[PDB]
Enzyme design. Structure first.
Site, PDB file in Angstrom:
ATOM      1  N   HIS A 187       4.864   6.651   7.179  1.00 55.60           N
ATOM      2  CA  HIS A 187       4.687   6.478   5.979  1.00 55.60           C
ATOM      3  C   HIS A 187       3.999   7.686   5.083  1.00 55.60           C
ATOM      4  O   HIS A 187       4.001   8.912   5.834  1.00 55.60           O
ATOM      5  CB  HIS A 187       3.597   5.262   5.417  1.00 55.60           C
ATOM      6  CG  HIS A 187       2.300   5.656   6.239  1.00 55.60           C
ATOM      7  ND1 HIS A 187       1.986   5.625   7.644  1.00 55.60           N
ATOM      8  CD2 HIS A 187       1.326   6.328   6.021  1.00 55.60           C
ATOM      9  CE1 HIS A 187       0.796   6.031   7.899  1.00 55.60           C
ATOM     10  NE2 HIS A 187       0.325   6.437   6.838  1.00 55.60           N
ATOM     11  N   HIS A 208       1.455   9.092   1.639  1.00 52.47           N
ATOM     12  CA  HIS A 208       0.364   8.941   0.726  1.00 52.47           C
ATOM     13  C   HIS A 208       0.652   9.910  -0.324  1.00 52.47           C
ATOM     14  O   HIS A 208       1.283  10.912  -0.275  1.00 52.47           O
ATOM     15  CB  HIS A 208      -1.049   9.343   1.144  1.00 52.47           C
ATOM     16  CG  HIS A 208      -1.295   8.459   2.425  1.00 52.47           C
ATOM     17  ND1 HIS A 208      -2.159   7.165   2.206  1.00 52.47           N
ATOM     18  CD2 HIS A 208      -0.901   8.557   3.698  1.00 52.47           C
ATOM     19  CE1 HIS A 208      -2.155   6.879   3.594  1.00 52.47           C
ATOM     20  NE2 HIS A 208      -1.531   7.664   4.493  1.00 52.47           N
ATOM     21  N   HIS A 246       0.902  -1.206  -0.025  1.00 53.36           N
ATOM     22  CA  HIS A 246      -0.042   0.146   0.013  1.00 53.36           C
ATOM     23  C   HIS A 246       0.825   1.261  -0.010  1.00 53.36           C
ATOM     24  O   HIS A 246       0.398   2.187  -0.675  1.00 53.36           O
ATOM     25  CB  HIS A 246      -1.067  -0.145   1.139  1.00 53.36           C
ATOM     26  CG  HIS A 246      -1.857  -1.288   1.434  1.00 53.36           C
ATOM     27  ND1 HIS A 246      -2.638  -1.620   0.465  1.00 53.36           N
ATOM     28  CD2 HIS A 246      -1.798  -2.295   2.377  1.00 53.36           C
ATOM     29  CE1 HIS A 246      -3.359  -2.940   0.825  1.00 53.36           C
ATOM     30  NE2 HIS A 246      -2.686  -3.073   2.052  1.00 53.36           N
ATOM     31  N   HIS A 254       2.853  10.973   7.389  1.00 55.18           N
ATOM     32  CA  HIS A 254       1.944  10.402   8.491  1.00 55.18           C
ATOM     33  C   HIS A 254       2.922   9.888   9.673  1.00 55.18           C
ATOM     34  O   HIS A 254       3.813   8.628   9.052  1.00 55.18           O
ATOM     35  CB  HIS A 254       1.061   9.431   8.488  1.00 55.18           C
ATOM     36  CG  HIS A 254      -0.246  10.069   7.672  1.00 55.18           C
ATOM     37  ND1 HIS A 254      -1.000   9.394   6.924  1.00 55.18           N
ATOM     38  CD2 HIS A 254      -0.596  11.341   7.616  1.00 55.18           C
ATOM     39  CE1 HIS A 254      -2.100  10.276   6.500  1.00 55.18           C
ATOM     40  NE2 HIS A 254      -1.668  11.498   6.893  1.00 55.18           N
TER      41      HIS A 254
HETATM   42  N1  LIG Z   1      -2.632   6.425   7.347  1.00 57.95           N
HETATM   43  S1  LIG Z   1      -3.067   6.109   8.844  1.00 57.95           S
HETATM   44  O1  LIG Z   1      -1.816   6.602   9.554  1.00 57.95           O
HETATM   45  O2  LIG Z   1      -4.042   6.712   9.346  1.00 57.95           O
HETATM   46  C1  LIG Z   1      -2.993   4.328   9.011  1.00 57.95           C
HETATM   47  C2  LIG Z   1      -2.099   3.553   8.699  1.00 57.95           C
HETATM   48  C3  LIG Z   1      -0.851   3.152   9.722  1.00 57.95           C
HETATM   49  C4  LIG Z   1      -1.601   1.999  10.603  1.00 57.95           C
HETATM   50  C5  LIG Z   1      -0.861   1.333  11.611  1.00 57.95           C
HETATM   51  B1  LIG Z   1       0.650   0.626  11.530  1.00 57.95           B
HETATM   52  B2  LIG Z   1       1.607   0.861  12.852  1.00 57.95           B
HETATM   53  B3  LIG Z   1       0.540   0.076  14.152  1.00 57.95           B
HETATM   54  B4  LIG Z   1       0.617  -0.785  12.503  1.00 57.95           B
HETATM   55  B5  LIG Z   1      -0.680  -0.778  13.332  1.00 57.95           B
HETATM   56  B6  LIG Z   1      -1.009   0.663  14.291  1.00 57.95           B
HETATM   57  B7  LIG Z   1       0.354   1.820  14.091  1.00 57.95           B
HETATM   58  B8  LIG Z   1       0.501   2.181  12.423  1.00 57.95           B
HETATM   59  B9  LIG Z   1      -1.158   2.102  13.378  1.00 57.95           B
HETATM   60  C6  LIG Z   1      -1.664   0.479  13.019  1.00 57.95           C
HETATM   61  B10 LIG Z   1      -0.943  -0.384  11.696  1.00 57.95           B
HETATM   62 ZN   LIG Z   2      -1.485   7.455   6.467  1.00 57.87          ZN
END
Ligand SMILES: [N]S(=O)(=O)[C][C][C][C]C1234B567B89%10B%11%12%13B85%14B%1158B%12%11%15B%139%12B%1061B%12%112C5%153B%14874
Ligand SMILES: [Zn+2]
Length: 257
Positions: A91, A93, A61, A116
């Protein structure tokens, strides 16, 4: 499975994740005239001096720059937040063209990309518990516009060739996310959600007013990534953004006059 295409993109997500049509979904348009200055908000405290990156991952993604979040090092606090939130990953977008790519919009303006930085509330012990809580995460969102290069981004850009396809990762140590911040920490804030499935309504959004500039060459390298895995037909990783969602019964607050 969900993604960003015609057949599996944001307009489809509600079938597997009905919270997609919930009361506090993200992103949103930030109407700058309607956002009210809140003199009770605090300056944001971004403490990234001891941030320890570990790895970069193409998850099919986006790409995630991951941090060691086993100790309290890299933390976000203040601003609208109660307590301490630990950096877990960042990350982006982005778009297929420079006129789109951000998730939040400002007076309907779309930026070329949005960064983000994701943080979890240490009062819940781990991220998996945090995302089940309305105050579990704080995401710091930063807009990207195309102009001058961002020197602090180039180490990320240069590793992308090594994680072209879904499921590839690379060691990515010693990256300092301070080099991705704009000068000002003026922000807007509102209660919202993850912008990807599972779309959980667990996020305090903090969106910086000041964009960072990146070069055309830097964002072009983002656009060479692939959503597909190795040995599959090429699908360029572009337009991995969810459009603005209804504000519903929410107020966007400004930290600045
Ligand atoms: N685009 S956004 O930042 O709103 C969601 C994308 C990141 C989602 C996650 B990754 B790490 B942990 B893993 B689990 B928790 B933390 B970040 B959020 C969730 B997964
Ligand atoms: Zn995001």
């Amino acid at each position: 499975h969900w993604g960003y295409g015609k057949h599996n993109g944001p307009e489809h997500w509600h079938k597997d994740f009905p919270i997609a049509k919930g009361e506090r979904q993200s992103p949103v348009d930030i109407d700058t005239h309607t956002a009210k200055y809140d003199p009770s908000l605090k300056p944001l405290s971004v403490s990234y001096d001891q941030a320890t990156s570990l790895r970069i991952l193409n998850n099919g993604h986006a790409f995630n720059v991951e941090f060691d979040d086993s100790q309290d090092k890299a933390v976000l606090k203040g601003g609208p937040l109660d307590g301490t939130y630990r950096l877990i990953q960042f990350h982006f977008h982005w778009g297929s063209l420079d006129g789109q790519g951000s998730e939040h919009t400002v007076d309907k303006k779309k930026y070329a990309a949005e960064l983000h930085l994701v943080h979890w509330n240490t009062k819940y012990g781990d991220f998996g518990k945090a995302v089940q809580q309305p105050d579990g995460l704080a995401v710091l969102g930063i807009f990207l516009k195309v102009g001058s290069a961002k020197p602090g981004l180039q180490k990320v850009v240069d590793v992308l060739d090594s994680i072209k396809t879904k499921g590839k990762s690379a060691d990515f140590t010693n990256f300092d996310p301070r080099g991705l911040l704009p000068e000002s920490l003026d922000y807007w804030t509102y209660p919202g959600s993850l912008t990807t499935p599972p779309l959980l309504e667990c996020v305090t959004w903090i969106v910086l007013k000041e964009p960072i500039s990146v070069s055309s060459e830097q964002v072009l390298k983002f656009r060479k990534l692939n959503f597909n895995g190795e040995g599959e037909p090429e699908e360029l990783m572009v337009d991995n953004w969810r459009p603005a969602q209804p504000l519903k019964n929410r107020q966007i607050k400004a930290s600045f006059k």
